[PDB]
Design a protein around this ligand. Sequence first.
Ligand SMILES: *C1=CC(=O)C=C[C@]1(O)c1nc2ccccc2s1
Length: 108
Amino acid sequence: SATIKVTDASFATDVLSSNKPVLVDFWATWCGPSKMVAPVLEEIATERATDLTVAKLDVDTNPETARNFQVVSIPTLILFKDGQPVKRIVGAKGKAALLRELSDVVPN
Ligand SMILES: *C1=CC(=O)C=C[C@]1(O)c1nc2ccccc2s1
């Protein structure tokens, strides 16, 4: 997987301080509908690798990070730019739709 896995511990280096925008997928190990977005994210990570990084955070095992960023529904996607959560996406989408939301902030 072109996507990366992040934790509470790794979040600051992996996501926050990244000079490249990161799309973070807040998901649950025990939620099946929350895993539906994974393949699409995988396609995106490979296809748009120069423009964007894709990260996956398991809210089940990293509760504080999920709470700090105020994730209320799963799956949730938050785009991080220069350390800030600049974009929040709820309701799982198709690829074209997801890419359209992201284009406002990401080139290509
Ligand atoms: C709720 C209950 C469940 O059994 C699986 C995970 C969940 O948190 C979610 N359910 C849905 C259903 C539709 C879309 C998204 C989610 S998350």
